Amino acid sequence: CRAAVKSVTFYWLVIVLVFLNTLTISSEHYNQPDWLTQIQDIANKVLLALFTCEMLVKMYSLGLQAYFVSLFNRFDCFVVCGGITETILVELEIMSPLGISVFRCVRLLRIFKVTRHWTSLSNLVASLLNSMKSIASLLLLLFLFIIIFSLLGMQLFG
Amino acid sequence: SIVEWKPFDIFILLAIFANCVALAIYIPFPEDDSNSTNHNLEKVEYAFLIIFTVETFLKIIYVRNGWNLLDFVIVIVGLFSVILEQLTDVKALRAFRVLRPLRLVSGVPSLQVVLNSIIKAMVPLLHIALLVLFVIIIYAIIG
Amino acid sequence: KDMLILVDVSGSVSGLTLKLIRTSVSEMLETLSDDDFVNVASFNSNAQDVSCFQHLVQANVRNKKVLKDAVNNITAKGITDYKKGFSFAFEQLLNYNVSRANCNKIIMLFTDGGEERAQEIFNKYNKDKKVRVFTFSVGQHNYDRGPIQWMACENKGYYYEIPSIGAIRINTQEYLDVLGRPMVLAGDKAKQVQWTNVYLD
Amino acid sequence: SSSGMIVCIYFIILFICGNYILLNVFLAIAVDNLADAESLNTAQKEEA
Amino acid sequence: VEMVLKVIAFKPKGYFSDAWNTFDSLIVIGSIIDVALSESITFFRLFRVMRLVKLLSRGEGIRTLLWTFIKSFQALPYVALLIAMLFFIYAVIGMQMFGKVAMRDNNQINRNNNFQTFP
Amino acid sequence: VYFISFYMLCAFLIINLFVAVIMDNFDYLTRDWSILGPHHLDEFKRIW
Amino acid sequence: FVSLVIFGSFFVLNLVLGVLSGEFSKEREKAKARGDFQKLREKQQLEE
Amino acid sequence: FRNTILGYFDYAFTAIFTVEILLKMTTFGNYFNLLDMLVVGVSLVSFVVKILRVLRVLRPLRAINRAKGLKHVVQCVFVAIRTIGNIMIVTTLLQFMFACIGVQLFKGKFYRCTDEAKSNPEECRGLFILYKDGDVDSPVVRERIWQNSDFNFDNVLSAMMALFTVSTFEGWPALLYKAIDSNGENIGPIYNHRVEISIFFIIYIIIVAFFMMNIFVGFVIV
Ligand SMILES: CC(C)OC(=O)[C@H](C)N[P@](=O)(OC[C@H]1O[C@@H](n2ccc(=O)[nH]c2=O)[C@](C)(F)[C@@H]1O)Oc1ccccc1
Ligand SMILES: CCCCc1oc2ccccc2c1C(=O)c1cc(I)c(OCCN(CC)CC)c(I)c1
Ligand SMILES: *[C@@H]1O[C@H](CO)[C@@H](O[C@@H]2O[C@H](CO)[C@@H](O)[C@H](O)[C@H]2NC(C)=O)[C@H](O)[C@H]1NC(C)=O
Ligand SMILES: [Ca+2]
C-alpha cells in the first residue's frame, strides 16, 4: 500500500479530487437550479466516502503514532470526522437549518491540501509558529487598547 | 505586611478582570434612564471600591513607581467620585474607571515588557510628528 | 369607549422614537368621536397628566386640539416605572364623578421596551379583565418586547409595532377589530342603524 | 460653537495612537518573521 | 530693519549666495509693497506665512531627515515616471470609455468628478 | 475591471516607489549615532 | 488640497514607514549576535 | 473643431513614426520593435473603430526602449512582481475561501423594499406614501421596488467583489450593518438582528487587510 501513496499518480488524483470538491463548494448561488442541488448533495456524499476511504488507507499504511505528531495531517482526521458527522446529523431527526452553512466551512478547508509541497509557504509558517507567543502577546495588547477606548467611548458618548 | 505573594497577586488580577466584565455589562442609557442591571452594578462597583482600597492599604510599606502611582490614583479618584455622587458633571468623574483594565498589564511581566518595547519604539517618530505639526499649522494659516 | 393613553416619557425614548410616539398619539386621537372619552397621561418614575384636564373629557374637536398641543410639547427624561404608570391609568378609569361613556374601557401604552411586567398591578386593579390593554412598541430599537407583548393578551388586548413613520397610520386604526369582537357575537341585536354628526362630504 | 468641540481630541488621539500601534504590531510581526524565513532559506539552500 | 542690517553687515556681494538669505528677501519685498495697498493682493499675503519655514532648519535631525529624503527622491526620478505613465494611460482610457456619462447633482459623476477633461 | 485593476496597480506601484526611496538612503535610517557618522566629521570641519 | 495630500500624507507616510523599517533592522541585527536565529535553525535542522 | 486640428497633428506624427520604422528596417535583416510596428499599424488601419481608438493609448509605451532608466525600472518592477507571487496566491486563496463562507452566510439575504414597512416581495408592490425628511405634513407618492443591494453575496463573483471592497477599507461599515440586519433567504431586514455576525467581518479584516497586506510590504522591504 505504501507504493501507491508514495507514487506520482496518487498525488495528482488527490489534487483532482480536491479541485472537484472546491468546484462543488463554489457553485452555490441564490436561485440555483433545482437539478444542481441534488448533484451537489450527492457529490458531497460520494466524495466524503472516497476521502474517508483514502484516509483509512493512509492511517493503516505507514503508522498510527508517526502521524499524530505532525500537525499537517492532524486536523485532516477532524475534517473527515466532521464531514461524516454532517451527513448523519442532517439526515437524522435534527434539521438545524443554520447547521448546513456551518458544516460547509470545515469541508471548504480541504482546499489547503494543495499547499503542502511549497518549501516557501511552510518556511514562513515555521517562523510564525515559533513566534506565536509574541504574536499572541501583541494581539492581546491591541485588544486591551481597543477595549479601553471602547469603554471610554461608552462613558463619553453613551 | 505578612508574606502573601503567590495567591494575593493572582486573586487581585482576577478581581481586575471581573471589574472589566462588570464595566462591560453596564448599558449607558440616554437621558438618565436605567434598568435593574445598573442598579445592581452600582453596588458591585461599591464592593470593588472597598476591596481595592483594602488591598491598597495592605501594601503601602510604593508611590514612587509609576504603575503603583496610577494604581492608587485610580482608587483615590474613584473614592472622590463616590463622595461627590453621594453628596448631590459629577457622573463624568467616573470616566477614570476605564483605566482599571490598564492595571492588568502590571500583573503580567511578559506583556509589560512588550508594552515597554512598543512605547520605547516611539521616540524616533517624534521628529516626524513635529514635522506634521509644522505642516498642519502652515496649511491651516494658508487656508 | 372610555379611552386612556399612557405615554412613556422615560429617558430611553428620547430622539427619533419620541417623535414617532407623539405622531402616533396624534393620529390615534383622530379615530375618536364626540361619543368617546379620552385622556392622555405620561410616566417617568412618576405618573402625571400631560394637560390641564386631570380626568376624562368628551374628546370633541376643541378638547382634542388641547390634548394634541400638550402631547406635542413633552420631553423625555427619567427612569421607567410601569407599576406607577399603570396605577395612575386604572385610577382615572374608576372616577365616576364625571360624565363618561360607561362603555369600552381601554388603556393604550406607547412604550418601546422594558423588563417589568407589573403582574401585581393588573391583579390588584383588573382581576376580572374589565379593561382592555393595547400595547405599542414604537421606534427602531432592540429592547425586550417580551413584557410588552404579555401585558396585551393577558388583558384582552392586542400588540402593535410602529418601527417607522409609514406604519403609524395603519397601526393606530387596527384596534377597532378587537373592540368589534363583542359586537359580532351579539348577532341581530347589534344591527342597529346610527346617524353621524354633520360633516362635509 | 460652545466648548463642545474640545471632545474632538478623543478621536484625534484615538486615530493617531491607534494607528501607531497597528503599524507597530502587524508590521513588526511581518518584518521580524520574514527576515527570519528569508535567512532560513539562505542557510537551507547553501546547506543543500 | 533685519534685512537692511544684515545686507549692510554681511557684504551684500555674497549675501544672496545663501539660499535662506535670498528666501527671506523675497518674503519682505512682497510684504513691504502691501502696506500702502490696504486702502492680486491676496497672493502677496501668503508670502509672510513662509517665514515660519525657516524655523524648520533650526534643529539637528529634523533638517537632515528632510535633506536626506528629498535627495533620495531626486536620485530616483524614473520610478515616479511609472506612476505618471499609469495615470496617463488610465485617464485616457477613462476618457474614451466613460467620457459620455451625464453629470448630475445626486450622483458620483457630478460637476466636480467626471472623465470629461484630462485634469 | 478598470477600477479594480487601477487600484491594484496603483497600490503596488506606490509601495514599490516608497520602498525604493526608503532603501536608497538606508545608512541614515540605521545610522547608530553612538559609534560615528558624517555629522561628527561635519562638526569637526565647522569647528576647524 | 492636492499638494496638502501629497506632502502631508504620502510624504509623511513614507517618513513613518521608513523610520519604522530602519528601527526594526537595528534590533534585528543586534539580537542576531545573541544567537536567536540559531535556536530556530537548530530546531528546524533536526526536523529533516 | 479642436479634434479636427488634433487629427491633423496625428497625421504628421504617424508619418514620422512610419518613416523611421522603414528606415530602421533598411539597415536590419526584438519584441520592442514589434510593439512599435503595432502602434503605427493601428493608426493606419484606423484611417470596429472604438477598439482601435482604445488601443491608440499605447503611444507612451514606445518610449520605454529609448530611455535606459525607464527600461531599468520596468525590469525591476517585473522582477519584484515575480519574487512576490507566492504571497499573492496565498491571499487570493484566502479571499476565495472567505467569499465562499460569505456566500453560504448571506446568500440572497441583502434584499430590501423601497419602504421599510413591507418585508417580502409579495408585499413590495404598487405605490406607497413617502414622508420627506421625516415630516408628517410633507408626503409624496413613490413606487415600491424590491431591489437587491449593490454589493451582495449572491454568488462567488459578487462575494469576491464585496470582500475586495471591504479589504480596501472603503464602504465596509455599510456592508457590515447591512449584513447584521440580514434576516432570511427572501425577506427584509430587522434592526440589529444578529450582531454576532460581525465576527466574520472582523476576522476577515484582521487576517487579510492587516496581516496579509502588511506582510506584503514587509516582504518587499526585506
Ligand atoms: C491607499 C492609501 C491609504 O495610500 C497608501 O498609503 C498606500 C496606497 N497603501 P496602504 O495600504 O494604506 C493604508 C495603511 O496606512 C497605515 N497608517 C497610516 C497612518 C499612521 O499613522 N499609521 C499607519 O499605520 C494603516 C493605518 F495602518 C493602513 O493599513 O499602505 C500601507 C503601508 C504599510 C503597511 C500597510 C499598508
Ligand atoms: C501589479 C500587479 C500586482 C498588484 C497586486 O495584486 C495582488 C493580488 C493579491 C493581493 C494583493 C495584490 C496586489 C497589490 O499590489 C496590492 C493590493 C492591495 I488591495 C493592497 O492593499 C490595498 C490598500 N490598503 C487599503 C488601506 C489595504 C489595507 C496593497 I498595500 C497591495
Ligand atoms: C369623587 O372623587 C373623590 C376623590 O377624587 C372621592 O373622594 C371623596 O371626595 C369628596 C371631596 O372632598 C369627599 O366626599 C371626600 O373627601 C372623599 N371621600 C368620600 C368617602 O366622600 C369621592 O368619593 C367621589 N365621589 C363624590 C360623590 O364625591
Ligand atoms: Ca426606559
mmCIF file with all atom_site columns, N, CA and C in Angstrom, chain C residues 158-176:
data_model
loop_
_atom_site.group_PDB
_atom_site.id
_atom_site.type_symbol
_atom_site.label_atom_id
_atom_site.label_alt_id
_atom_site.label_comp_id
_atom_site.label_asym_id
_atom_site.label_entity_id
_atom_site.label_seq_id
_atom_site.pdbx_PDB_ins_code
_atom_site.Cartn_x
_atom_site.Cartn_y
_atom_site.Cartn_z
_atom_site.occupancy
_atom_site.B_iso_or_equiv
_atom_site.pdbx_formal_charge
_atom_site.auth_seq_id
_atom_site.auth_comp_id
_atom_site.auth_asym_id
_atom_site.auth_atom_id
_atom_site.pdbx_PDB_model_num
ATOM 1  N N  . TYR C 1 158 ? -54.185 43.711 22.387 1.00 0.00 ? 158 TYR C N  1
ATOM 2  C CA . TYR C 1 158 ? -53.503 43.315 21.168 1.00 0.00 ? 158 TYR C CA 1
ATOM 3  C C  . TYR C 1 158 ? -52.175 44.058 21.142 1.00 0.00 ? 158 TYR C C  1
ATOM 4  N N  . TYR C 1 159 ? -51.225 43.550 20.363 1.00 0.00 ? 159 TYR C N  1
ATOM 5  C CA . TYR C 1 159 ? -49.871 44.091 20.338 1.00 0.00 ? 159 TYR C CA 1
ATOM 6  C C  . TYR C 1 159 ? -49.566 44.655 18.958 1.00 0.00 ? 159 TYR C C  1
ATOM 7  N N  . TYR C 1 160 ? -49.011 45.865 18.924 1.00 0.00 ? 160 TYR C N  1
ATOM 8  C CA . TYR C 1 160 ? -48.736 46.569 17.681 1.00 0.00 ? 160 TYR C CA 1
ATOM 9  C C  . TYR C 1 160 ? -47.284 47.019 17.644 1.00 0.00 ? 160 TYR C C  1
ATOM 10 N N  . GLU C 1 161 ? -46.740 47.093 16.435 1.00 0.00 ? 161 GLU C N  1
ATOM 11 C CA . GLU C 1 161 ? -45.373 47.531 16.197 1.00 0.00 ? 161 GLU C CA 1
ATOM 12 C C  . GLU C 1 161 ? -45.397 48.764 15.307 1.00 0.00 ? 161 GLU C C  1
ATOM 13 N N  . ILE C 1 162 ? -44.678 49.804 15.711 1.00 0.00 ? 162 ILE C N  1
ATOM 14 C CA . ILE C 1 162 ? -44.567 51.013 14.898 1.00 0.00 ? 162 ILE C CA 1
ATOM 15 C C  . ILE C 1 162 ? -43.089 51.341 14.720 1.00 0.00 ? 162 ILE C C  1
ATOM 16 N N  . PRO C 1 163 ? -42.396 50.708 13.770 1.00 0.00 ? 163 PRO C N  1
ATOM 17 C CA . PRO C 1 163 ? -40.965 50.967 13.593 1.00 0.00 ? 163 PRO C CA 1
ATOM 18 C C  . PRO C 1 163 ? -40.620 52.128 12.674 1.00 0.00 ? 163 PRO C C  1
ATOM 19 N N  . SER C 1 164 ? -41.591 52.736 11.997 1.00 0.00 ? 164 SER C N  1
ATOM 20 C CA . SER C 1 164 ? -41.301 53.827 11.080 1.00 0.00 ? 164 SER C CA 1
ATOM 21 C C  . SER C 1 164 ? -42.527 54.723 10.971 1.00 0.00 ? 164 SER C C  1
ATOM 22 N N  . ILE C 1 165 ? -42.364 55.831 10.244 1.00 0.00 ? 165 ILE C N  1
ATOM 23 C CA . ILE C 1 165 ? -43.455 56.786 10.075 1.00 0.00 ? 165 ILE C CA 1
ATOM 24 C C  . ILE C 1 165 ? -44.567 56.179 9.231  1.00 0.00 ? 165 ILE C C  1
ATOM 25 N N  . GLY C 1 166 ? -44.207 55.377 8.229  1.00 0.00 ? 166 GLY C N  1
ATOM 26 C CA . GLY C 1 166 ? -45.201 54.790 7.349  1.00 0.00 ? 166 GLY C CA 1
ATOM 27 C C  . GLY C 1 166 ? -46.115 53.789 8.022  1.00 0.00 ? 166 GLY C C  1
ATOM 28 N N  . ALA C 1 167 ? -45.722 53.267 9.179  1.00 0.00 ? 167 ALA C N  1
ATOM 29 C CA . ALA C 1 167 ? -46.535 52.303 9.906  1.00 0.00 ? 167 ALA C CA 1
ATOM 30 C C  . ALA C 1 167 ? -47.445 52.951 10.938 1.00 0.00 ? 167 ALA C C  1
ATOM 31 N N  . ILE C 1 168 ? -47.400 54.277 11.076 1.00 0.00 ? 168 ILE C N  1
ATOM 32 C CA . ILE C 1 168 ? -48.196 54.949 12.099 1.00 0.00 ? 168 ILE C CA 1
ATOM 33 C C  . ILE C 1 168 ? -49.679 54.880 11.760 1.00 0.00 ? 168 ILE C C  1
ATOM 34 N N  . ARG C 1 169 ? -50.031 55.179 10.510 1.00 0.00 ? 169 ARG C N  1
ATOM 35 C CA . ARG C 1 169 ? -51.439 55.325 10.156 1.00 0.00 ? 169 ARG C CA 1
ATOM 36 C C  . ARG C 1 169 ? -52.161 53.985 10.152 1.00 0.00 ? 169 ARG C C  1
ATOM 37 N N  . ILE C 1 170 ? -51.493 52.925 9.703  1.00 0.00 ? 170 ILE C N  1
ATOM 38 C CA . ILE C 1 170 ? -52.170 51.641 9.568  1.00 0.00 ? 170 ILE C CA 1
ATOM 39 C C  . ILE C 1 170 ? -52.305 50.937 10.912 1.00 0.00 ? 170 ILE C C  1
ATOM 40 N N  . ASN C 1 171 ? -51.430 51.237 11.870 1.00 0.00 ? 171 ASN C N  1
ATOM 41 C CA . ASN C 1 171 ? -51.435 50.538 13.147 1.00 0.00 ? 171 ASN C CA 1
ATOM 42 C C  . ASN C 1 171 ? -52.302 51.209 14.201 1.00 0.00 ? 171 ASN C C  1
ATOM 43 N N  . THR C 1 172 ? -52.570 52.505 14.070 1.00 0.00 ? 172 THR C N  1
ATOM 44 C CA . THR C 1 172 ? -53.395 53.207 15.043 1.00 0.00 ? 172 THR C CA 1
ATOM 45 C C  . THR C 1 172 ? -54.885 53.071 14.769 1.00 0.00 ? 172 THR C C  1
ATOM 46 N N  . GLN C 1 173 ? -55.274 52.377 13.701 1.00 0.00 ? 173 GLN C N  1
ATOM 47 C CA . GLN C 1 173 ? -56.674 52.160 13.381 1.00 0.00 ? 173 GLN C CA 1
ATOM 48 C C  . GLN C 1 173 ? -57.089 50.699 13.459 1.00 0.00 ? 173 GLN C C  1
ATOM 49 N N  . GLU C 1 174 ? -56.161 49.786 13.727 1.00 0.00 ? 174 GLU C N  1
ATOM 50 C CA . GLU C 1 174 ? -56.464 48.363 13.765 1.00 0.00 ? 174 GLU C CA 1
ATOM 51 C C  . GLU C 1 174 ? -56.992 47.902 15.114 1.00 0.00 ? 174 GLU C C  1
ATOM 52 N N  . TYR C 1 175 ? -57.114 48.799 16.089 1.00 0.00 ? 175 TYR C N  1
ATOM 53 C CA . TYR C 1 175 ? -57.664 48.408 17.379 1.00 0.00 ? 175 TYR C CA 1
ATOM 54 C C  . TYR C 1 175 ? -59.182 48.315 17.366 1.00 0.00 ? 175 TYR C C  1
ATOM 55 N N  . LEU C 1 176 ? -59.833 48.722 16.277 1.00 0.00 ? 176 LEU C N  1
ATOM 56 C CA . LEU C 1 176 ? -61.281 48.609 16.181 1.00 0.00 ? 176 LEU C CA 1
ATOM 57 C C  . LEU C 1 176 ? -61.735 47.207 15.808 1.00 0.00 ? 176 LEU C C  1
#
